[PDB]
């Protein structure tokens, strides 16, 4: 994988129609909603924290997965799976491309340089706008310090600056 700065900016149209894309990669995020997901038990939670994007850009699938792991592990350890609801709010629909010389990927991929430059699929990313919610947490007011810490850890894994907004439901 290239450094994430290579795919951070929105430089072209969304590339999502998988029926026209050969070898589009499979999404490598196993779950998107963590903790207590049933709507009845979520009624106990009365606070909402959001990790909100500050800039527009593309977040790679592995960064979303890395952010999801660190925050969910922290909440499981310190808050408890029965006392919170955490949702990864964006889905990596956009397919990333790379122009590299490769074997077993088509004859055109054997031409070097910028000849036949249209890249083969290299991964997935979510295209986000300023103010967009990346992570969404529902919790009880007693755990505010722990929820803020979990979202601070998630933010350290993401390629764009974010900010934490805490509001009641």
């Amino acid at each position: 994988a290239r450094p994430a700065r290579c795919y951070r900016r929105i430089k072209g149209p969304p590339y999502t129609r998988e029926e026209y894309i050969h070898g589009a990669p499979m999404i490598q995020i196993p779950k998107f909603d963590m903790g207590t997901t049933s709507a009845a038990a979520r009624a106990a939670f009365t606070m909402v924290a959001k990790l909100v994007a500050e800039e527009r850009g593309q977040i790679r699938m592995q960064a979303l997965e890395a952010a999801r792991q660190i925050s969910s592990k922290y909440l499981t350890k310190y808050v408890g799976d029965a006392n919170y609801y955490l949702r990864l709010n964006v889905v990596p629909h956009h397919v990333l491309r790379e122009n590299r010389m490769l074997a077993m990927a088509g004859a055109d991929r054997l031409q070097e340089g910028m000849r036949l430059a249209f890249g083969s699929p290299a991964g997935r990313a979510a295209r986000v706008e300023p103010g967009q919610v990346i992570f969404y947490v529902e919790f009880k007011p007693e755990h505010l310090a722990h929820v803020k810490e979990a979202l601070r850890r998630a933010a350290s894994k993401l390629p764009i600056p974010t900010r934490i907004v805490v509001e009641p439901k």
Binding site: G23, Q28, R100, M101, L102, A103, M104, G106, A107, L110
Partner: protein, 290 residues
């Protein structure tokens, strides 16, 4: 005890390839122990996987005097889980037309690789839905199949990019009469280097009298010089399990199909064999008696 899950077919290659392995060393490894997919590790003392390469990657060599390492040509691996079923992984291999995949456990630790050879062997212990080659075989008249048909006297430069790029899994080589002279796959190019000729960018010719600064290819090898000769051919009434046994054993994924006079009318690919074992006959086809 028929294998059903990926964990029953995971294989470990006899050789270890890192990002610093050269393409010449990689070709030497595959000469001795042919495998369908090679995991590439970040270092000698780490089991972390930097990516995968295919046997086709060894054929990207341009010159024996030019440095070329495996780490410069890493493919994005197709990743499956050890708990998945054999049929499901076979579907993904058909979808991507890839000869293998990397197997990881629940936490993403590298377990091993799974290949077309392994799946074919595992399905060998079962009963094909369709039993005859006629039910699942690619005709010679198809527009863009995964098998090529080439004359024995053709130059290898004509078909080289289609093989290395993976647009076909192999070639059926025809004699003057349209019979099967032999089979050509990437393994022919890995076993022998009679086809190879070094190239490169123009040399730094300054301050001297040198009249040929760039190497040029002049005598190009013909296909029959490096093809596999004497392969067994199949008939429409040939059992599909004999074809499957061959492909599983030798890792050659193309078998010619001939009519009663020996004229080639198509081929059976490893994708055709999987289709028989997974679904049955192709649309508009009937299973003839074996």
């Amino acid at each position: 005890r028929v294998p059903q899950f990926v964990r029953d077919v995971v294989e470990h290659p006899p050789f270890r390839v890192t990002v610093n392995t050269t393409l010449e060393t990689l070709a030497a490894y595959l000469r001795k122990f042919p495998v369908d997919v090679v995991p590439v590790f970040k270092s000698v003392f780490s089991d972390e996987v930097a990516g995968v390469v295919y046997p086709h990657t060894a054929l990207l060599l341009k010159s024996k005097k030019l440095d070329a390492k495996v780490g410069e040509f890493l493919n994005q691996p197709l990743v499956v889980k050890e708990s998945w079923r054999i049929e499901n992984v076979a579907e993904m291999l058909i979808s991507e037309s890839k000869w293998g995949a990397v197997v990881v456990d629940e936490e993403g630790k590298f377990v091993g690789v799974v290949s077309l050879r392994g799946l074919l062997s595992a399905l060998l212990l079962r009963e094909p839905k369709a039993k005859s080659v006629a039910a699942v075989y690619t005709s010679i008249d198809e527009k863009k199949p995964r098998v090529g048909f080439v004359k024995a006297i053709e130059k290898v430069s004509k078909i080289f990019h289609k093989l290395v790029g993976g647009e076909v899994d192999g070639y059926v080589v025809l004699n003057r009469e349209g019979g099967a002279a032999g089979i050509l796959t990437v393994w022919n190019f890995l076993k022998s280097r009679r086809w190879f000729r070094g190239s490169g960018e123009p040399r730094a010719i300054f301050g001297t009298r040198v009249t040929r600064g760039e190497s040029k290819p002049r005598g190009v090898a013909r296909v029959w010089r490096i093809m596999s000769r004497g392969v067994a051919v199949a008939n429409p009434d040939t059992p599909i399990t004999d074809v499957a046994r061959y492909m599983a054993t030798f890792g050659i994924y193309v078998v010619p199909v001939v009519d009663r006079n020996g004229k080639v009318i198509g081929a059976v690919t490893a994708w055709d064999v999987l289709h028989a074992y997974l679904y049955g006959p192709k649309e508009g086809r009937e299973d003839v008696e074996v």
